[PDB]
Amino acid sequence: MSTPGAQEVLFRTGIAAVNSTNHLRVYFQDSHGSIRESLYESGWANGTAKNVIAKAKLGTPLAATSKELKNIRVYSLTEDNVLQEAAYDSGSGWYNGALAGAKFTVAPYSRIGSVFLAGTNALQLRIYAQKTDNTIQEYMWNGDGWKEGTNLGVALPGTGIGVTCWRYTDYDGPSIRVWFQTDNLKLVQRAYDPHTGWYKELTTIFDKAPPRCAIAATNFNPGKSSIYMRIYFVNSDNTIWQVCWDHGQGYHDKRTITPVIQGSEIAIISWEGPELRLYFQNGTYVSAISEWTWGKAHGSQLGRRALPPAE
Amino acid sequence: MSTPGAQEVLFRTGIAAVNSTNHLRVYFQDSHGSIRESLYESGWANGTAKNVIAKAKLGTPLAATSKELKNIRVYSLTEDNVLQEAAYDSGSGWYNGALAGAKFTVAPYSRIGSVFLAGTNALQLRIYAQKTDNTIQEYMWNGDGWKEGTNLGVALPGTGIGVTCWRYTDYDGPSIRVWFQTDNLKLVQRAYDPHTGWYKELTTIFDKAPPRCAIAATNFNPGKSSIYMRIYFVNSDNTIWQVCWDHGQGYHDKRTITPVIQGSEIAIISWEGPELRLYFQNGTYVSAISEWTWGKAHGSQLGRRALPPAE
Numbered sequence: 065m066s067t068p069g070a071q072e073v074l075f076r077t078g079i080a081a082v083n084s085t086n087h088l089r090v091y092f093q094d095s096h097g098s099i100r101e102s103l104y105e106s107g108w109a110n111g112t113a114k115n116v117i118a119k120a121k122l123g124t125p126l127a128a129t130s131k132e133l134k135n136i137r138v139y140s141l142t143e144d145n146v147l148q149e150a151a152y153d154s155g156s157g158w159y160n161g162a163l164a165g166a167k168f169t170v171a172p173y174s175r176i177g178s179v180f181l182a183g184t185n186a187l188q189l190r191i192y193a194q195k196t197d198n199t200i201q202e203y204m205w206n207g208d209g210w211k212e213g214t215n216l217g218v219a220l221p222g223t224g225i226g227v228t229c230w231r232y233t234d235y236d237g238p239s240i241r242v243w244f245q246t247d248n249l250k251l252v253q254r255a256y257d258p259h260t261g262w263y264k265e266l267t268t269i270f271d272k273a274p275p276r277c278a279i280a281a282t283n284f285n286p287g288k289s290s291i292y293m294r295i296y297f298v299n300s301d302n303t304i305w306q307v308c309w310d311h312g313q314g315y316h317d318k319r320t321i322t323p324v325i326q327g328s329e330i331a332i333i334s335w336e337g338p339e340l341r342l343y344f345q346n347g348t349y350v351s352a353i354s355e356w357t358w359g360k361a362h363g364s365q366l367g368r369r370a371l372p373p374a375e
Numbered sequence: 376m377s378t379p380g381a382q383e384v385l386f387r388t389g390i391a392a393v394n395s396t397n398h399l400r401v402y403f404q405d406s407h408g409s410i411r412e413s414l415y416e417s418g419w420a421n422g423t424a425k426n427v428i429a430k431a432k433l434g435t436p437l438a439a440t441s442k443e444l445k446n447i448r449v450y451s452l453t454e455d456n457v458l459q460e461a462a463y464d465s466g467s468g469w470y471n472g473a474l475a476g477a478k479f480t481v482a483p484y485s486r487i488g489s490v491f492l493a494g495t496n497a498l499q500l501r502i503y504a505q506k507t508d509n510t511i512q513e514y515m516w517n518g519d520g521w522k523e524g525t526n527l528g529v530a531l532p533g534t535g536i537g538v539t540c541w542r543y544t545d546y547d548g549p550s551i552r553v554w555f556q557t558d559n560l561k562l563v564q565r566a567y568d569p570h571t572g573w574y575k576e577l578t579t580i581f582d583k584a585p586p587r588c589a590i591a592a593t594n595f596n597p598g599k600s601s602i603y604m605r606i607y608f609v610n611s612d613n614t615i616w617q618v619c620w621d622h623g624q625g626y627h628d629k630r631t632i633t634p635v636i637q638g639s640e641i642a643i644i645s646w647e648g649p650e651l652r653l654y655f656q657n658g659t660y661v662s663a664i665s666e667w668t669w670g671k672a673h674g675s676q677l678g679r680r681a682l683p684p685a686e
C-alpha cells in the first residue's frame with residue numbers, strides 16, 4: 065500500500081524543517097539521493113523531483129535552520145563525508161554555501177545539528193557533527209569564514225544530535241543547548257550561556273535510549289531567565305517520546321507522543337502559541353512522511369498524513 | 376560503547392551468509408559502501424578493509440548463495456540500481472560475474488534473494504528482486520546467459536525477500552519457496568515444485584509484519600515428499616520471529632527468537648543436525664553483527680557476540 069510519490073521518499077530518510085510561524089518547509093532525501101523541499105503555504109505542495117535543493121550521500125543526516133524564511137540553510141554529507149551546505153536567501157534562490165570549501169570531514173555515521181544564533185539580526189551559524197574520534201564538534205560562521213568552534217566531547221558513535229537556541233530577554237547573548245547520546249546509551253545535554261560559556265556539566269535527560277536513536281529539539285516563549293524546551297527521540301517502543309523542560313518545573317515530564325517506523329528520523333519545529341509540528345515516518349504509504357501537531361485548540365493530534373510528494 | 380572495528384560496519388547493513396556445514400562465510404557492507412567477507416574456520420576471522428569482495432550502493436540489499444564453499448555468489452545493487460554479482464570459485468579467487476552485463480534494473484528499494492538450485496551438480500541460479508512496478512521478478516542463469524524467469528506478482532514496495540531451495544528425494548527437480556510482504560503487510564509464500572511449476576496459491580505465513588521488515592529463510596532434512604523450513608523476520612517488537620514448517624505438522628509455530636536493533640537486516644544458514652545460525656545487529660558495540668545459534672546439544676543460544684572486524 066504505497067503511492068508513486070511516496071515511493072520516491074527514502075525509507076528512514078533524514079528529515080529537517082524550518083518555518084516562519086505557520087509557513088513551513090520540510091526537507092528529506094529521495095531514493096536517488098537528492099534532497100527535496102516540501103512546503104506549507106496555506107496548504108502542502110512540492111517535494112517532487114523538480115524541487116531538489118541538493119544532492120548528498122545516500123542515508124545522509126539532514127539538518128536545517130533559518131531566519132524566518134528569509135535565510136535558510138540545509139546541511140548534509142557528501143559521499144566523502146564532508147559537511148556541505150545548501151543555502152537560500154530571499155530573492156537570490158538556492159545556491160551552494162561556503163561550508164564545503166572548509167572541507168570539514170566527519171565520521172561516516174555522523175549526524176548534524178544546526179542553528180542560527182537567536183536574538184540578533186546578524187547571521188551567525190553553529191553546526192554540530194561527529195568527528196572520527198566520536199567527539200561532537202562545533203563548526204561556526206560569524207562573517208569571518210567557517211572554522212571550528214568548541215568541542216563538546218565524546219558521544220556514542222552515530223549519536224543523534226539535537227540542538228536549539230534562544231536568547232533570554234534579560235541576557236546580552238545567545239543560549240545554546242545540545243543533546244546527544246553517550247556510550248552508556250543515556251541521553252544527555254550540554255549547555256552554553258553568555259559569559260559562562262559552555263557549562264562543564266552533562267545533564268542526563270533520559271536513562272537509556274536505543275543506540276543511534278534520532279534526537280530533535282525545539283524551544284518557545286523565551287523570557288526573563290526563562291525558557292520552555294521540548295526534546296524528542298525515538299524510543300525502544302518504536303514511538304517518539306517527548307522530554308519537557310518548563311520554567312518553574314525544570315525537566316519534569318517524559319511521555320510517548322506517536323508511533324513511528326523502526327529507525328525513523330525526526331524533525332521538530334515550533335512557533336509561539338505554542339504550536340508544535342513533528343515530522344517522521346510511521347509507515348503511511350510505507351515511506352511517506354507524516355506530521356504530528358500540538359496546539360492549544362486541540363492538543364495532541366496527528367496532522368498531514370502524507371506530505372508531498374506522497375499525495 | 377563501540378570499537379574501531381565495529382564502527383566500520385554499516386548500521387542496518389544488508390547481511391548474507393553461506394556455508395559448508397560449520398565452515399561459514401558472512402557478508403556485510405562497511406560504512407564506505409564496500410562489501411566485506413568475514414569467515415569461520417574453527418574460529419572467526421577477517422571482515423577487514425583487506426577483505427573486500429565488492430563495492431555497492433550505500434544501503435544495498437545483500438544476498439548470497441553457494442555450492443558448499445566451492446562456488447559462492449554475492450548479489451548487490453550498483454548506484455544505478457542494477458543487479459550485480461561478486462563471484463568466487465575454488466582456485467580462481469574473487470571476480471565479477473556476468474550478471475551486471477544483463478543490466479537488470481530494479482526499484483531503488485529492491486531487496487534481493489538468491490539460490491543455487493539444489494539436488495544437482497549443475498550450477499543453476501535463481502535471483503529474485505523487485506522491479507519499479509513492485510512485482511517480484513525472477514532472474515536465472517542456466518548456462519545460456521542471464522535472462523528473466525517467472526514474475527511472481529506485486530509485493531509491498533521495499534519488501535524483504537526470503538528464498539530457499541531443496542530437492543525432494545522422490546522428485547526429479549528442485550523445489551523453491553519465496554517469501555515476501557504484500558500491500559496488506561501480510562507475509563506470504565510463493566511455491567515452485569517440479570511439473571506443477573509455480574503454484575498459483577499465495578500462502579499467508581504471518582498476518583501483519585512491520586513495513587519492509589527483513590525476511591530470511593532456510594530448509595533442512597529434505598526427504599520423500601518431506602521438508603523442514605524456517606522463516607525469520609523482524610517483528611514490531613524489535614525481535615526476530617521464527618515461523619516453522621515441519622513435515623507432518625505443516626506451518627504450526629510462531630515464536631520470538633532474539634532481540635535486534637530497530638530495522639536490523641538478517642541472514643540465516645543451516646546444516647544437517649539441524650544446526651542453525653542467525654546473523655543480525657542487536658546493538659553489540661552499537662553496530663557489530665551478532666550471531667544466534669540453534670543445535671540439539673544446547674537449543675537456542677546466542678553465539679559470537681561481535682563478528683570480525685568488531686573484535
Ligand SMILES: C[Se][C@H]1O[C@@H](C)[C@@H](O)[C@@H](O)[C@@H]1O
Binds near residue numbers: 087355357367368
Ligand atoms: C489544521 Se492544523 C495545520 O497546521 C499547519 C501549519 C500545517 O501543520 C498543517 O499540516 C496542519 O493541518
Ligand SMILES: C[Se][C@H]1O[C@@H](C)[C@@H](O)[C@@H](O)[C@@H]1O
Binds near residue numbers: 103133152
Ligand atoms: C516561492 Se515559495 C519559496 O519559499 C522559499 C522560502 C524557499 O523555500 C523556496 O524553496 C520556495 O520556492
Ligand SMILES: C[Se][C@H]1O[C@@H](C)[C@@H](O)[C@@H](O)[C@@H]1O
Binds near residue numbers: 149151162188
Ligand atoms: C554570504 Se552567503 C553565506 O551565508 C552564511 C550565513 C553561510 O551560510 C555561508 O556558508 C554562506 O556562503
Ligand SMILES: C[Se][C@H]1O[C@@H](C)[C@@H](O)[C@@H](O)[C@@H]1O
Binds near residue numbers: 190204
Ligand atoms: C567567540 Se565564538 C563562540 O560562540 C558561542 C556562541 C559558542 O558557539 C562558542 O562555542 C564559540 O566559541
Ligand SMILES: C[Se][C@H]1O[C@@H](C)[C@@H](O)[C@@H](O)[C@@H]1O
Binds near residue numbers: 241253263291309
Ligand atoms: C545552568 Se543552565 C540550565 O538551562 C536550562 C534551560 C536547562 O538546559 C537546564 O538543564 C540547565 O541546567
Ligand SMILES: C[Se][C@H]1O[C@@H](C)[C@@H](O)[C@@H](O)[C@@H]1O
Binds near residue numbers: 294338340
Ligand atoms: C503545558 Se505542558 C504541554 O506543552 C505542550 C507544548 C506539549 O509539549 C505537550 O505535550 C505538553 O503536555
Ligand SMILES: C[Se][C@H]1O[C@@H](C)[C@@H](O)[C@@H](O)[C@@H]1O
Binds near residue numbers: 397399415652666668
Ligand atoms: C560453540 Se557453537 C559455534 O558454531 C560455529 C559453527 C560458529 O557458529 C561459532 O560462532 C559458534 O560459537
Ligand SMILES: C[Se][C@H]1O[C@@H](C)[C@@H](O)[C@@H](O)[C@@H]1O
Binds near residue numbers: 400444445
Ligand atoms: C582461504 Se579462506 C577462503 O575461503 C573461500 C571459500 C572464500 O570465502 C575466500 O574469500 C576465502 O579467502
Ligand SMILES: C[Se][C@H]1O[C@@H](C)[C@@H](O)[C@@H](O)[C@@H]1O
Binds near residue numbers: 448462499500516
Ligand atoms: C562461468 Se563463471 C559464471 O558462473 C555462473 C554460475 C554465474 O554466476 C555467472 O554470472 C558467472 O559469470
Ligand SMILES: C[Se][C@H]1O[C@@H](C)[C@@H](O)[C@@H](O)[C@@H]1O
Binds near residue numbers: 501513515524549567
Ligand atoms: C525452464 Se527455466 C524454470 O526454472 C524453474 C526452476 C523456475 O525457476 C522457473 O521460474 C523457470 O521458468
Ligand SMILES: C[Se][C@H]1O[C@@H](C)[C@@H](O)[C@@H](O)[C@@H]1O
Binds near residue numbers: 552566602620
Ligand atoms: C502445495 Se506445496 C507445499 O510445500 C510445503 C513445503 C510448504 O511450502 C507449503 O506451504 C506448500 O503448500
Ligand SMILES: C[Se][C@H]1O[C@@H](C)[C@@H](O)[C@@H](O)[C@@H]1O
Binds near residue numbers: 605669
Ligand atoms: C523440533 Se522444533 C525446533 O526446531 C529447531 C530447528 C528450531 O527451529 C527451534 O526453534 C524449534 O523449536
